[model samples]
Target: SMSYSWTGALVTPCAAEEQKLPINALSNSLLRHHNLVYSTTSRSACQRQKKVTFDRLQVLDSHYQDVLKEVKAAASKVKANLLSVEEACSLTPPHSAKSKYGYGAKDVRSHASRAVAHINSVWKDLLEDSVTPIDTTIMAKNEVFCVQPEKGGRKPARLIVFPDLGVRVCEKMALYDVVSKLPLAVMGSSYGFQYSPGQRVEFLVQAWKSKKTPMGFSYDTRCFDSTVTESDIRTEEAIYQCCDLDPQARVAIKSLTERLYVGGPLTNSRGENCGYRRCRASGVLTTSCGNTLTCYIKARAACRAAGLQDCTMLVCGDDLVVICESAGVQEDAASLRAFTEAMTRYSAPPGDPPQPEYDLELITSCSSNVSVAHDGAGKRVYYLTRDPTTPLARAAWETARHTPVNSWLGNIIMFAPTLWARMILMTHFFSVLIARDQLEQALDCEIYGACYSIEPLDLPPIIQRLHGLSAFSLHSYSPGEINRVAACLRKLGVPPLRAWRHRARSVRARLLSRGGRAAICGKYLFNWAVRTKLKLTPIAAAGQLALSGWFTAGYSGGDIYH
Candidate 1:
């Protein structure tokens, strides 16, 4: 096939297992070794080791600059479009948060007379009145908490709101594109996920010119979004004010900003008011947009003011990276202290101080790192990674209601070239489902409101688009990473990586002996071994890795085009 075709379905999942299949022979081999795959210790130990040497040096190549230009140009075109209140309500996915003023999830559109009326009324008041920041209602988001193994277990979900579906639509119209563009533009190549696993490692290696004094590190904000002060909220409004919006659009933006964007009262799961928030909340529609723009503006202005040299910034929500000139040892050290002070003055403090890495080999953002290893061919490989505890936990949970977003799939798409993801993550889960005959049943895994199918044969286009041409060419393995996989297989009761690798060779033989999707899978998932060459599927929709490819602000991290 010249190009992989999308099923057009938002989500494609494993079908419910009814009976064992002949395919079980391949997957069962893994089941026989399941006990060897589940260990958390090695995965955890690997994470610790990576953290310890994270500051290793890196070098920047011309290709890095080229990709950055492409990203920035693509980012520059993002623009939010206006929608009718009804259209806005309709866009809310079924699983989205429900309203508290007696509205169900479907009621926003289906039985929307009451819901629409409330939404329109709130919107009207915002347009007609100069709403203050104090008018919004805030509530604890128990449904969306994240596990913080390092902090005190799971942190409380941040406060969000039910300020009318119409208000949310207004937010989407005014800010979605801005949210998409501002971070990439302000930060450029520093956006962590923008680089492939290998390219990221390359970036750090090239940038870290001196082993004795490597000079790059991620700058994290302490509760970044939540840390936005009342003053910071006004700064956000000021930035929005600079946009050339239509008259009504401008008022609507301000109204939403003051009423919902600024702060609100905190209500708990019991529906009782517990306290109030005077800062930003994580659960709101505009939260990401507001946070990104605010952080970029503050950091950009602060860096310039603080004399941080050759600063390259990449800010996503609150995750930040600064690629800058390494002043000498003492100067760089003092520069970091100055940066912390300036950032703190801007209302954001470091979650982890801006420590310099010797290079780009490992930098944490969104709780993941960019690291390296050698593949089976002894060729170096790059991959995005994090501790395995959460991945293992989430994979286990997919056995049932299959809760929440498809993060694992997204990670695979973003890091398809990584040996850990393909050889370990893919091999482990697919074998489990196949062993139980669940491979055919549709399952749900989603991210950023878009749904997708995680079926093995269904992933070639996703890999091609996110990782692009490199996905097909990457192969080989690092003994350490490979060893970790074996340990995980032992602990998880799955077959070792060696087993999957062996099966891959056979699978490839059969797949190539035949043709179609399975053949394509063999060409891709096991591309390292394929002697025949194939063209990468082109992603025309919001997908480009070149300067000219930057015209559309498409989703990143290997999400296929819409």
Candidate 2:
């Protein structure tokens, strides 16, 4: 089946789209090349559509069936429950699109009678009509990034197809429990969403170390959402059916699988039919879990076909990295080619072909890689780091404009220990907030699928909890990591690392003068900036922060609210 069949209707934007970065007084302080940073709009979405729309072919093997059987067994151990209406209602984001029935996100969150009644009716409808093709809104997603000259200068906007608020809430009611509990249970350590940054680093380090002469590579499936075939979706549903669920929950899951999960009619923001999708919906409750499961199955089968030994895979949604024992360089390259061939046959082709690497630091997955640094006691510490060009560019954009999701804050929280995140992202943002005296105001940031109101002042404890005290005292970063950061800064026209150090020291002093949680933030987060660094200690509040849903799942295109 075709992944998508579109009508003549264009993917329209509800509001004016900003293509060029808007500069402010503080923009150059973070990044100088404002022209290099651009946002994608609906105009460029056709390019993305052309790339993603394709015919898929799959040939399952014995290895795939074996893995599927194991997954089903693990899934059977999970007991999932349907979420109550009030429970699902509470998960709606404040800024979510209102229903056509006149109930908005605010009304739903407050559990107004109208919203609750409508949600109940939606749930009942889902149970009653399992064969109908449910409706979904297809829109072009606007995102900011630095230009990639090699990828034709600028990337087009991504397409996000999601259901209405009522259906979304109902999706949570049916599948939220299964999604939260099943992935980790079935995939174990390979399920990447369950780890904190610190834990993720540890898992990768351990996995890499477990193999003798380890060879690793990251697999990037081309347009993973569109690659998801109807059979794959039904396979995901069968796995879910293995779970020990209540009768109503089971019915809801099956109904949702038939009516919504398989495929749907795509509508534009103007309520016009845009297309018909036979591919996975990018914005659905099951997106992350379904993608993770399907990718895992195909990659595992591909590994077997390639005759890879001692393989350890880390999968988060469609992003995956596999570490295995290396043969000779010549053989490893041939094996990777075979792996790619097998993956292509399984209908999950690579965006960029995989290359085997002997060094663990060279293979990046989920846009991050392992890097080495020294702690205060002169002991080597391994941590996750990423190229900061995109982060810095997005930070510059966020500083100039107010966006709903603070990607900078999320980066700081998730990658608090990285050299660029600490010295540059922390220093730059704190200074801006301090200048505006908005440190006390809460901004929304997403972790997993849920949004949380985070204050700048609370960062000290949040960082300590998510990372560790080592996050603050880490110094003497590896030369390779330092070089990457330096190169990225130069390429993006960001200030050199030395300039950020000076800025950090100033920000640290300001926070210290405030003398409270702000002082703790300065002393712990910016200790590397000063000559006389303060001794770092664990924040008391770190242990008390309830971070239950923080690293539970991936929800990039999933229109998740909780």
Candidate 3:
């Protein structure tokens, strides 16, 4: 079957889309390469559609069946319940798209009588009709980034296919508890979403160390969502069926699987038929979980087929990194070739062919890799870091325009221990906030799938709680890490490391001039800016922070909010 069948209707936008970075005083101060930053619009979505449309063929083997059995067994230990109407309504994000019906996100959130009644009616319909295909709205997502030279000037917008607001709520009602609990149970520590940045680093480092002459590679599945076959989705449904669910919950799950998960009719924002999708929908409750499970199953089976020894895979949705014992350099390369062949047979061919990497830092997954820096105690600390081009580009956009999902704040929180995030992003954003006198305002940022109302002043304690005291005092980064940051700065037209140090010193001084949390932020986050740095101490509020839900799951397309 085809991934998509179009009806010649264009992927339309409900609002005007910005294609170029808006120039402002703050934008110029952050990034000078205005020409390099561009946003994707609906015009480029045609290119994306061309890229993702393809036929998929999957060949399952004994190894795949073995993995599937284990997964189902793990899933059987759990019990899942359907979410109450109010509970499902509460999970809707404040900025979520409104239904074709009258109610909006605010109405759903407040449990308005009309919205609740509609939601209940929708649930009843789901239970009653299992054969009708659910309708989903397909749109091109406008996102900001630096233009890639190799990929022409600007990349196209990603296509997002989602159902109505009421159906989205019903999705949560049927599967929220299952997705929140099942991945960690089935995959254990290998479930990448269950780890914080620091924990992820630790896991990768430990796995690398555990291997004798380690060989590793990150697999890049070409359009994983499009690669999903109808059988694959049905297999995912069977895995969910293994759970002990109530009779109503069971019926809802099966209904959603047949009507929405396997395939659906695609409608545009203007209420016109865009196409039909037989591949995985990017916007659904099961997207993250299904992708994780499917990727894990295929990769594990491929490893066995390739005769890779003691493979340790870290999977977050479609992003995968595998570390295993090497069979010498020549043989390791051959083994990866065989693994790629197996994955291709299973309908997950690589975009770029995988090469066996001897060095742990050389292999990147989830757009991040393990890197080393010196902590306060002069001990080598392994932490996660990534190319800062996208983050910096998005930060410049956010600085100029008010947007939902502050990627800069999320990057600062997740990558606090990294040199670029600390010396550049933290310094730059704090200076902007101070200039605008908005330090005390609560800004919305997401971790996992849950939205958090984080005030800029609370960063010190948040960093301490999530990454520990070492994040604040990290220094003397490895040459490779420093070089990457320098290269990223040069490419993005950001100020050099030394220039940021000079600016950070001023930001630090300004913060210190004001007492309380601002002073703590200055003394800890910007310690590198001063010649004689203050001795870092543990944050008193760190232990009191409740962050168990922070690293529990991936919610990329889940439409989840706390």
Candidate 4:
């Protein structure tokens, strides 16, 4: 018998809107403590090195496999001819794509949608009632990407960026108390559009919406111009530098310049300019501004006049888009067209659409043409181009063809619901449950029968153990942890690490290597491996010194010292 321990995480990559699988903390963490105890009187020399490809995810997901099957079936069963997985997986809908700033919002929206739908289907009504302040909007989730604001020194919500792009989830209270006060449009499409680095972001928020906000919204147009005070403002000039406790989490939005009316019809289609607004090219009111933003501005003014706080403008792309739609009279077709055309303007450097990709780079296809993984901490992502005509544009099209390296929670449900169904209840402890579930089910002889403590509701089919733990665990490992003695035997004897001295030398060499990472990794390694004497860098290091090595592990074959 053999016993092994490991630490790592499994995460899905999703940053852009159309990349699919959006803002689902999109990850899980696992740090093994207990082992498969072995009673070995005769150790068989105890030197037998076996390759244990640890698979702790119960619902090991394939992009278009079981989860998609169930979800498709469920949707079909309900007679809803919603978008097919192929269509959704292969190509981003017209409504989805990176905004002007190349950020992914649709992907987050899809992830949110899946979370919502999964909870709705499996968890039933708990989604709406229990999940407060958690709106399943792409921009809403995107706003919190990389920034985790703290709440009472306890970070309640955990935000995991797909592909784990080094974005830290900060605390939420600081987000609401400080960051939320910034002008983040609390409604649709306002989130999709990112600010132009200090552009004034306006918001039309309700009292409750404003109150629910962790902090105020503020965009910095300081670079654009001076003399613009909060009173002389349209949006605030701020970069959500830090929150209370969790420094990693920061909402993307800046602050609103003006205090505008914040609400309008969201669910029902009552307004004519529902998601668009008419804007005249040179915007001088009169013939009516023929764009979404302008119309939204007009509608916001109307909301202000009518005392509709919920109809206020926000820095969020979709919500802003919605507000733009709510502008103008109920029967203004020209206005709607003008608004949509104005907002969704397409001008790609006045050139040809780029070439697409024919194959993936450096990615080994693991059966069934399914390969999902991000590069190591430093390596570039290897993705198949959906379309490849030019270097500038082909990558996106090519990427669209295959699943992103980081598959979002939506991928699990849309492609693997059985996986999501397995661990629905263990939200807080999802990573551990998923890791246990995977190991138990993945191993040939292991069995997780009814009597086993982990119930079906405890896990969702979406976050498989292999995927979840591999993406979120290593943060908990320590020096000599994960049986470093084993890491020694395996790497030296089989694969990853080598001799203790050689490893130390290599680490030292790595620390000295030239790159932005050398400094950060140096700091992180020092912080994490407390026993290992590491000299601190003279340069200041800010926020989350805790390195999420597992997120970086996917890039390497296995820095995953599991």
Best by lDDT: 3
Q: What lDDT score belongs to each candidate, Candidate 1 first?
A: 0.53, 0.87, 0.90, 0.22
* Error in Å for residue 9 of model 2: 0.9
* Candidate 3 local lDDT, 407-442, one digit each (tens): 889999998999989988999999999999998898
Error of 2 at 124 (Å): 1.1
Q: Number of the top candidate by TM-score? A: 3
The ten-residue window of minimal lDDT in model 2 covers 553-562
By TM-score: ranked, best first? 3, 2, 1, 4
Better of 1 and 4 by TM-score: 1
After superposing candidate 4, which stretches have Cα over 4 Å from the reference?
Answer: 1-177, 180-234, 238-331, 338-405, 408-410, 413-562
Candidate 1 residue lDDT tens string, 1-562: 1001122211111123211111234434433332222212211322222222111112323433344344445444544445567555654555545665677557874747877777777667777876664333333322211244466543332323345444554555555545445545544565443454445556655555424444666778776655676666765665555544567667877776777666654443344454445566555555655666666656665565556777666665666777677777678778788777767766677766878654464566666666565544466666665655445434433432245455566555655766657765665555555456664454545433234445655566656655455556665545555565556555545655666676666656655555675566666666554455555455342153232222223232111112
How high is the lDDT of residue 55 in model 2?
A: 88
Clash pairs (backbone) in predicted model 3? none
Show pairs that collide, candidate 2.
Answer: 450-562
Candidate 1 lDDT trough over 10 residues, lowest sum: 1-10
Tens-digit per-residue lDDT, 203-252, candidate 2: 88899889879999999999999889999999999999999887888888
Question: What's each prediction's TM-score?
Answer: 0.71, 0.97, 0.98, 0.19
Candidate 3's C-alpha runs over 4 A off are: none
